[PDB]
Amino acid sequence: ANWFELCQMMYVSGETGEPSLETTGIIEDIVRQQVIEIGLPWEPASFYSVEVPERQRLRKADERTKAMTKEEYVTWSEFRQASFTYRKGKRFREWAGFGLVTDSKPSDDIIDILGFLTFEMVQTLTEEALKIKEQEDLHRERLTGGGGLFDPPNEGRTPVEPRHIQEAFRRLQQRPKKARAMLNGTKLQQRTQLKLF
Amino acid sequence: LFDHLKPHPYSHFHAHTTLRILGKLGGRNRKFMTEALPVTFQQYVDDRASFDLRLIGSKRDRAFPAHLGIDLAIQKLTEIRQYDPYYKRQALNLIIAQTKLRVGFDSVPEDLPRLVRLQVEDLVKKNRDVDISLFEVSDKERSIAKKNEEQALLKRLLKALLYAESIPEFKQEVDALLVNLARHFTLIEIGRSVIDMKKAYTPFDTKSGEGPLFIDNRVLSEAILESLANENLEVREAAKRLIKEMHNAAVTVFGSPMHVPRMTFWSSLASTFCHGCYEEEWFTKQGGALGIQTLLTEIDLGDLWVAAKQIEFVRALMYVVKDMPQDLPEKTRRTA
Amino acid sequence: KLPIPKVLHDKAIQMPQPVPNIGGAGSGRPTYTQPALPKTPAFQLEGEGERVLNKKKLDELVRQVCGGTAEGQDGNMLTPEVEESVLNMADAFVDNVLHQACRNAKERGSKVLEIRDIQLVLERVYNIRIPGYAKVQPNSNWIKKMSAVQAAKV
Amino acid sequence: ASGLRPQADPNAPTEMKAYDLEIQTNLILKAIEVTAMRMEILGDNRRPFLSVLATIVEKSLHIPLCEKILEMVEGWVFRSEGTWPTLKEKTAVLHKMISFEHRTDPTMLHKFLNLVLRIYEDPKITRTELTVRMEHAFLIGTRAQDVEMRNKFMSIFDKCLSKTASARLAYVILGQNWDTLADSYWLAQASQLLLGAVDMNPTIQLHQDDFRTLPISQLVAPYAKDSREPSVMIDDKFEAFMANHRRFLAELGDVRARDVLEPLMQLQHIDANFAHEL
């Protein structure tokens, strides 16, 4: 499920190729894991009992927008509306196991927030995987004459692979050193919970 | 029995029944062998007939087999969707090309008619001043078995061409080709007769061998014999028309019908049709009887000829009456 | 006789599939001796070869985690005394993880080793999470004790 | 038609009256036509439309309905100008149309193969993304039974490749993917491709060591120096006879390589043993 939303989101983020099914499965597993794992009350105004009334992403995005055709622009705009939970409440709730882990039927604002978060996760994952793949190819870089009838014109572009996604996920799970500053000088193994990237 | 043992897609009733029979037989299913094993071999070790080709990205020609599709072509032609005529036409084209290749190509002097009439004059008389030195050169470097195989193949091709007259589309082309071939063979036969006449008049024992090796042109007689008693009608009519054409061409070349029966071809034809009566297949007997009838009542070679051949003809026809089994139809006996 | 059915069942008409070499006698023995369609062995016509890829693997990892290497230099990123330590680390990790996982799997009555046991060991003893491969509450006595203590407190 | 027994399943297939069948088909045609003119704004409904089209073409045997769907697909491929039905997704529908080859009714197969032939004869789309996803269709065409269609496909195939024997052999060995034709003897097509790199104009003849009938030149050679005159005069009939014979002799030595080679490559397609030999 949600394979096609994944494909559209990858296309939006810079993956114009045709990723295989394993990449989709891995990304869906990651997103499902994160979702299942998942002014303000603590603002300064809360110190008192009674309240009173008041009174590089951008550069790349612009370059790509300037560097696309009308048909490409239409396709990009149409894919930009891809969502995990847009008018798919029941399907998402079945794919998210709401009943088994929480009281059923929350408000739709929660669903909108979840869709926004999922879009962000997919965007970040694709953006990092592209860099990892490019670096691998760049390091790696450094016989049929005549011709056939079904030969591709120029080829040259390939999609990302499961290993790139796994490496990006490992890179995303690292925490700041402030969560380890209290284990300096000791031999204590660090153990924590899943990080919500 | 062993041919019905095939996996699922093949009908499993036959396979399972055959397996059951073989199992029930017991130890008697691997004991029936008496001889060693049949094996298929070749009559000669020389290279087979071939013609040169020329690949585009190469500088030297390469030989190609000259017998490749003949069997399939004949099988598809003489054994009868909406695509059949296409394949029949392809087979006929291949057969015609192969026949033309077998007959060969030749270049003749400019004034052939003068030499042909000189040959006729020498044959009518008994001139002894003709040199046949080229026909006493011994040929002891080529195979004879290969010659026989080529002869058989040519006979098969001619038989297929003769049968091809029962299809209205192909009648005209094959008929014209056969008529031309018959005239060519008569032209060959006149000179062969002159050579044969000269040869027998020098009884020697010198160490000069025989003539060269060539495909006998008299395979047409065997094809005609095998074609006379056919189920169709146009085939029989064509078989008779070929003999009539041979006789007419001989008359035209000789000049008058007086000396036509002085050739050696007609004795060979009579011998062929007389021996056809002694075979053990009824259709060959019918063909032989019909050939004798055609020779007697449609050519009129003469009277001395018939007076000479009467005994052989009578013996052959009496044997045809004798040897026909007494439970098959009576058509052959009535013809005899 | 024999019951030749009018139609075979689905098990007999199968379109055979490749099969491995089972039995334990061994393969490739040139002595005196079969499935319908055996499976082809593995082969490589021409290339770098495993003897090179395996050795280059460690330098590849060092390049990955080192950030990057400039042109004209590579490979010699670990001194001879550190590569041995890294290899010992790898072997010890593999052995320990497998030994723990097999016993853990056998504990719960299973008879085969599944990925779940390895994943549990890695998560709960090493803080490693590999993606893409598929609570507690108190009882009544504790609540009663807390209520008694709180009542006594006031 | 297969005679399978009917089982008790609530959604089991059933039979419908001819009148009701025609009414339903008309309704489906109208619905598809009305829905297909707003392809630019289908949005979330873009995919179910193509899915139902693919299912209909895959299963249904109604000739008018499949004909209309095929005409619509051709219009999308060729005369469309705007944003396409998901770009190269109409190819997903086209791939499902390969099932026509086993229907016992070559009308739909012939229409589909005509469409493919039109696609592959167009200079505008050459070595493009569209001609790279139709390999299965082209190969199925080369395997066809109708002689004209198969000959057209083979003619295009030969026209595209080179004319060097080594080049053609290399292309056959390591240039083509024969995965589509894995269940049939596909070496006949390879032999047909190979035979296209052979000169076919020059005349042919058996070697000089082979056996042929007796030449007339050998028979008449003894009279080379005999300057005699026949007693009987040469007449008109004899002259006509010899003129016709000379014409036949000239016709005899006019056999080209094509005369023998082409029928072989045409006959090999109805016999596997002869293809093996060739």
Automatic annotation (TrEMBL), chain A:
Cellular compartments annotated: Nucleus
Coiled-coil intervals: none
Superkingdom classification of source: Eukaryota
Family, similarity comment: Belongs to the SPT3 family.
Protein name in UniProt: Uncharacterized protein
Organism field: Chaetomium thermophilum (strain DSM 1495 / CBS 144.50 / IMI 039719)
Lineage summary: Eukaryota, Fungi, Dikarya, Ascomycota, Pezizomycotina
Coverage span on the entire protein: 133 to 433 of 433
From TrEMBL, chain B:
Protein purpose: Serine/threonine protein kinase which activates checkpoint signaling upon genotoxic stresses such as ionizing radiation (IR), ultraviolet light (UV), or DNA replication stalling, thereby acting as a DNA damage sensor. Recognizes the substrate consensus sequence [ST]-Q. Phosphorylates histone H2A to form H2AS128ph (gamma-H2A) at sites of DNA damage, involved in the regulation of DNA damage response mechanism. Required for the control of telomere length and genome stability.
Similarity section: Belongs to the PI3/PI4-kinase family. TRA1 subfamily.
Subunit description: Associates with DNA double-strand breaks.
Protein name as annotated: Non-specific serine/threonine protein kinase
Originating species: Chaetomium thermophilum (strain DSM 1495 / CBS 144.50 / IMI 039719)
Taxonomic path: Eukaryota, Fungi, Dikarya, Ascomycota, Pezizomycotina
From-to range in the entire protein, with total length: 905 to 1252 of 3893
TrEMBL record, chain C:
Record localization: Nucleus
Organism: Chaetomium thermophilum (strain DSM 1495 / CBS 144.50 / IMI 039719)
The protein's name in its UniProt record: Transcription initiation factor TFIID subunit 12 domain-containing protein
Segments forming domain Transcription initiation factor TFIID subunit: 55-128
Family the entry assigns: Belongs to the TAF12 family.
